[PDB]
Design a protein around this nucleic acid. Structure first.
Lengths: 185, 134, 445, 246, 200
RNA sequence: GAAACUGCGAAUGGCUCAUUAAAUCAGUUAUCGUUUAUUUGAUAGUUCCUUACAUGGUAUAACUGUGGUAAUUCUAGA
């Protein structure tokens, strides 16, 4: 006796698990994008599979069908604002041409590494979770964050970081205390 | 350096319960979590009412700090504050008193026993006294 | 039996008359974070903004429209005073309960800003206030009364000096409210005028008290104005928590003088009696003392005139008030008694000695009883029996431990042929009471 | 179940109250009164959930007991009073009158209302009979009984009612070409003019209605409610004026 | 003796002045003047001298300055308050002394008097930054040396006349007390590329 | 304001799925075939009619007091 929350699984293991072309596919993806889990890859794979099934059904509908027009325009603007789809390809056909690398390229850790706040994809991952990179005004410590367009313009170091702001971290000021004390003695 | 800001939004003047009810934004950078006492002091300064009339509650600090958001009430007179505020929030502010009461278990147990006694009981007390005394 | 052991609960009922009887007036006795006293870009404008945010009513919304367009700054007030005042009075005359708290509040503040220029509106400001108060009676609202009389109190507070200088006109303006045929109108209007009179200095106070007593002879038939003055003066003197103050003693002096004047009304003397009764009941003796010395000194100043019965009146009041626990010095009282006896060289007289016997101290009765009874048998001859029965009924054992029997005997010896009927009536009365055994065993001529 | 129910779950509520599905387990079951269970708005759902003048049930009870709220001129202190349709709820300390009328989306829309319009109320004449001692009476759509009506007031009509006196100022006959408000089913909230009344004997009469953009729909007589003549409604219509668009 | 009475006195003096000036103009009007003095905070343009100006006869005057590449300027003008009635300026020597402050890439702050609209801006006082204020850490939040060491870029004079505040490429922001030009407080912008580009 | 009488609630809630295969239940009807506390709206001069209405009557509780039983939310007599 209350109303039950709605939950939902966010991924789905692919059809035939062990298939060497896909094993190497996941290897290349995880390596070049800094991921850690066939589960993260499957999360993106599931999202995109759902998207493309939506688009395909709309295509099979008739041109100018009201349902197609409404839902399709919604989907296209959602992807364009996510940044996956370029402006000039506002068509459900390019939606069908999307891919997993596009979604991973939108993830946050990739965007840090690209914009240069980090030196490697793993440096970037660590920073994000270390609470060093704030989007706009708001610290973000989720590496999967899918920056939008203007947001990817606004990423920076957080005003609390020893890197973009306040007093240096504990190791640095402990070392400083050590050196000042040793100079005193 | 450290300059707390108090600002209000969504002010709704509710004269039914004789108050103004609004939403408070507190900007604290390089600081944690401004106190409700200081919030009430400064809100009273701004709204020209008495710290006994002002009341705030429900303050949540956003992820990353520097800003917390809450709800606030500013009653028309300390009279109406005492008239309408809940006992618990008055108790928090020290306007009312904490009542002492037993636990729920003791209360319900005393209730059941007294349910088992009819009348005023004092003749029962005398009767058991003498029945033992025999 | 007023509600005295509060119920545990939180929302009681409190009917209208209960609220009003619990209501009082003084704001300085009251206190809180007053907005206008707080912020200072202009008092009227301060209250005006607070209220525009707080009050959401048709009349005040209209009024706020017009005036917020006009006023925003003190020079603008000073320039456009009349238009603002007419607007306020227009709405107050509209008499709308939801808008009156802001309208009256703004009126008080408007005077506060405009002080010594407000007098040219003062008269019809007050007219509008009294009309509002009677209409409020019609549509009972204790909140309305609280607001209205506080507006009056504040207007007096802000225009203290000028009103004090021209005091009596204020009393003429308020006399509808003062003598109004409703307890609480009398009560509240008198409390406001009480603040003002206590503020007033001595000379204008003398003029005022003369004028008001002659007004009392004007409304000799009326009693309402009478207790209106009663409650006014008594509050003006007792204003503090348990202790009247220096202005109160000056008030007592001026009233006592202007009642002892031979042109003063004897009903006014009764009024002073009542005031003293209330003060004696209220304050404590240590506080009362300077009043006592002032009164004794004033009696010593002017006891010697045809006002002797008047002095009797006031002194009977003093002795009866409550008791010796408020009486400082029965010895001084005795000095006054014998001095008045010498000056006299009647019924009030018997009443006075009876109260003296009942209420005075044994250590003074020891050395004054003899002269007291001699005074009785000398001056109040025919009434002495009146007296002695009255004393018996008040407190017999005091005279019995003292010499009731011997003085009764000697009175019988001195005179029996004038009022033997009265003597018989007295004895007829006293036979039944079993506490009068000594009176049964007195002797006869 | 052996008697009347006194509780209402939260999922089981009327949907048009817009009650969140997590704040609790129970919804205000509206007390018995003028309007039916499912087409009424209780005073707590109106004072707390719509007006946001309260934050609690205990705040709503404080307001009512302080005696501010009047539902059709009379002061109502029941916190689950079933305020219904075409109702007038006045909050004087705020100087507001509210006609409760439907929004296009189906839900009750607040409709701010002036004093001279809060003075009256429309009611759908719904049962005309001959009462005891031979006085005839009308029964409107919110319980109200009104005696000595005009003889020309027939079932399914509208009567404009002075609230201050419980009397009938005037009326409107149910004929084609009047303006119609709709109160049930898929189209509720849609105002149009009444084109045809297809009448079945023993079944349900249907009505064909046509809104200002000449879009036609078919509803039941149970759900039609006559408002005013063409182009002039007797009440003030909420914004959008009952036009469903894309 | 009372604050309310004092405010009444000042206001009535204001009215005496207004009536005298209205008579002067003569040789509605008072309400209009009061309404304008109000009308400042309602933000609609009211000051409509758009065409009363005499541009062709405007009197022009250059005044050379020593340092090179003046970057920016800020002028301070005392007004008279309308809530109270004292003045805008701070001290009592001033009594309506119009000031100007110029900041130059050469790291110079220069205050001039421009009170007289017929003589050249007179160079009252100045303060020059330079290299001796370079921070010894150079690599932290704290940047708080009491002077500029690079390219002062904007200046703004406080409307109450007590301070003037300058900022530039050194990523600092310094408030000076006006009279002695003395640096009273320094606030870093605490960002590696947080250069101040404008002040208002 | 304890006790007790009077009024109201205790028929809702919560729990389980044993029974039940045109039964339940689902959608759809009818009551011109019936009861309805409550809510809400209306609604009750009867002037007279042969020999207290400034307001009839008796009880009972709690209580005082006398008791019974191993014992219960037992209860007797006055």
């Amino acid at each position: 006796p209350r109303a039950p929350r709605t939950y939902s699984k966010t991924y789905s293991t692919p059809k035939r698990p062990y298939e060497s072309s896909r094993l190497d596919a996941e290897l290349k993806l995880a390596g070049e994008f800094g991921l850690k889990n066939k589960k993260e890859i499957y999360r993106i794979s599931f999202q995109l599979s759902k998207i493309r099934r939506a688009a395909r059904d709309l295509l099979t509908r008739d041109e100018k069908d009201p349902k197609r027009l409404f839902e399709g325009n919604a989907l296209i603007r959602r992807l364009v604002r996510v940044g996956v789809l370029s402006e000039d390809k506002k068509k459900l056909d390019y939606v069908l041409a999307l891919k997993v690398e596009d979604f991973l390229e939108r993830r946050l850790q990739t965007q840090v590494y690209k914009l240069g706040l980090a030196k490697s994809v793993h440096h970037a991952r660590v920073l994000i979770t270390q609470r060093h990179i704030a989007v706009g005004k708001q610290i973000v410590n989720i590496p999967s964050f899918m920056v939008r367009l203007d947001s990817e313009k606004h990423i920076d170091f957080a005003p609390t970081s020893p890197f973009g702001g306040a007093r240096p971290g504990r190791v640095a000021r402990r070392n400083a205390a050590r050196k000042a004390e040793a100079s005193g003695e | 350096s450290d300059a707390v800001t108090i600002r209000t939004r969504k002010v709704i003047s509710n004269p039914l319960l004789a108050r103004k009810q609004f939403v408070v934004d507190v900007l604290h950078p390089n600081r944690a979590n401004v106190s409700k006492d200081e919030l009430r002091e400064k809100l009273a300064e701004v709204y020209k009412a008495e710290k006994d009339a002002v009341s705030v509650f429900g303050f949540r600090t956003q992820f990353g700090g520097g800003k917390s958001v809450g709800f606030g009430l500013v009653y028309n007179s300390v009279a109406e504050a005492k008239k309408f505020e809940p006992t618990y929030r008055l108790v928090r502010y020290g306007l009312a008193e904490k009542v002492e009461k037993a636990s729920r278990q003791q209360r319900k147990q005393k209730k059941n026993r007294d349910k088992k006694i009819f009348g005023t009981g004092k003749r029962l007390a005398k009767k058991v006294a003498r029945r033992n005394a025999d | 039996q007023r509600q005295t052991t509060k119920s545990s609960k939180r929302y009681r009922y409190s009917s209208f008359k209960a609220r009003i009887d619990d209501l009082k007036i003084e704001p300085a006795r009251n206190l809180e974070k007053r907005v206008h006293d707080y912020v200072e870009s202009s008092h009227f404008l301060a209250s005006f903004d607070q209220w525009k945010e707080i009050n959401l009513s048709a009349k005040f919304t209209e009024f706020a429209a017009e005036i917020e367009h006009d006023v925003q700054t003190l020079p603008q007030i000073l320039y456009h005073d009349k238009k603002i005042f007419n607007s306020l009075v227009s709405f107050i005359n509209f008499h709308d309960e939801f808008s009156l708290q802001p309208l009256l509040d703004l009126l008080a503040q408007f005077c506060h800003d405009l002080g010594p220029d407000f007098l040219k509106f003062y008269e019809e400001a007050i007219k509008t206030l009294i009309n509002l108060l009677d209409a409020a009676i019609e549509f009972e609202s204790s909140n309305v009364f609280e607001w209205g009389f506080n507006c009056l109190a504040y207007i007096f507070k802000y225009l203290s000096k000028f009103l004090v200088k021209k005091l009596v006109l204020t009393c003429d303006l308020l006399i509808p409210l003062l003598s109004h045929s409703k307890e609480y109108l009398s009560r509240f209007s008198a409390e406001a005028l009480s603040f003002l009179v206590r503020k007033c200095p001595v000379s204008n106070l003398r003029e005022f008290v003369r004028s008001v007593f002659e007004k009392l002879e004007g409304d000799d038939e009326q009693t309402n104005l009478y207790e209106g003055l009663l409650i006014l003066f008594t509050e003006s003197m007792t204003s503090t928590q348990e202790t009247l103050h220096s202005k109160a003693k000056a008030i007592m002096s001026v009233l006592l003088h202007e009642a002892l004047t031979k042109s003063s009304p004897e009903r006014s003397v009764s009024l002073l009696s009542d005031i003293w009764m209330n003060i004696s009941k209220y304050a404590s003796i240590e506080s009362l003392l300077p009043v006592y010395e002032v009164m004794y000194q004033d009696f010593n100043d002017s006891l010697d005139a045809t006002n002797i019965d008047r002095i009797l009146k006031v002194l009977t009041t003093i002795v009866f008030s409550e008791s010796g626990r408020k009486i400082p010095d029965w010895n001084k009282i005795t000095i006054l008694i014998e001095r008045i006896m010498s000056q006299s060289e009647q019924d009030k007289v018997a009443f006075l000695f009876a109260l003296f016997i009942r209420n005075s101290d044994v250590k003074t009765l020891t050395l004054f009883h003899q002269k007291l009874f001699n005074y009785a048998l000398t001056n109040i001859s025919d009434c002495f029996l009146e007296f002695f029965q009255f004393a018996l009924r008040l407190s017999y054992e005091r005279v019995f431990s003292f010499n009731g029997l011997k003085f009764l005997q000697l009175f019988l010896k001195k005179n029996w042929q004038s009022q033997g009927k009265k003597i018989a009536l007295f004895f007829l009365e006293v036979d039944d009471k079993p506490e009068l055994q000594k009176v049964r065993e007195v002797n006869f001529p | 179940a052996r008697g009347p129910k006194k509780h209402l779950k939260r999922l089981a509520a009327p949907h048009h109250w817009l009650l969140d599905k997590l704040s609790g387990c129970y919804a205000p079951r509206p007390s018995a009164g003028p309007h039916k269970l499912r087409e009424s708005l209780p005073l707590i759902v109106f004072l707390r959930n719509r007006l946001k003048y309260a934050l609690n049930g205990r705040e709503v009870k404080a307001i009512l007991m302080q005696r501010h709220v009047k539902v059709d001129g009379k002061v109502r202190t029941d916190t689950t009073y079933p305020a219904g349709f075409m109702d007038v709820i006045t909050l004087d300390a705020t100087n507001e009158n509210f006609r409760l009328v439907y929004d296009v989306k189906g839900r009750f829309a607040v409709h701010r209302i002036t004093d001279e319009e809060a003075s009256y109320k429309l009611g759908k004449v719904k049962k005309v009979q001959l009462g005891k001692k031979g006085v005839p009476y009308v029964v409107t759509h919110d319980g109200r009984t009104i005696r000595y009506p005009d003889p020309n007031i027939k079932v399914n009509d509208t009567v404009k009612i002075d609230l201050a006196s419980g009397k009938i100022t005037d009326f409107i006959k149910f004929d084609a070409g009047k303006l119609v408000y709709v109160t049930g089913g898929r189209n509720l909230g849609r105002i149009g003019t009444i084109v045809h009344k297809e009448r079945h004997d023993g079944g349900f009469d249907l009505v064909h209605i046509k809104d200002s953009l000449d879009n036609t729909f078919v509803t039941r007589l149970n759900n039609v409610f006559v408002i005013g003549e063409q182009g002039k409604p007797y009440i003030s219509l909420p914004k959008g004026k009952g036009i469903k668009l894309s | 003796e009372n604050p309310a009475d004092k405010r009444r006195r000042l206001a009535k003096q204001y009215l005496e002045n207004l009536k005298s000036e209205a008579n002067d103009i003569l040789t509605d009007i008072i309400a209009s003047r009061l309404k304008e003095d109000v009308a400042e905070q309602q933000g609609r343009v009211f000051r409509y001298f758009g065409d009363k100006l005499l541009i062709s006869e405007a009197k022009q005057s250059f005044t050379r300055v020593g340092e090179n590449n003046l970057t920016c300027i800020s002028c301070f003008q005392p007004v008279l308050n309308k809530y109270t009635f004292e003045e805008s300026s701070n001290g009592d020597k001033n009594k309506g002394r119009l000031f100007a402050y110029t900041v130059s890439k050469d790291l110079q702050l220069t205050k001039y008097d421009i009170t007289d609209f017929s003589k050249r801006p007179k160079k009252l006082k100045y303060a020059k930054g330079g290299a001796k204020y370079i921070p010894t850490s150079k690599h932290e939040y704290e940047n708080t040396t009491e002077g500029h060491y690079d390219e002062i870029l904007t200046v703004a004079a406080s409307p109450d006349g007590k301070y003037v505040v300058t900022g530039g490429r050194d990523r600092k922001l310094i408030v000076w007390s006006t009279e002695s030009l003395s640096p009273v407080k320094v606030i870093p912008t605490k960002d590696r590329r947080g250069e101040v580009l404008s002040l208002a």
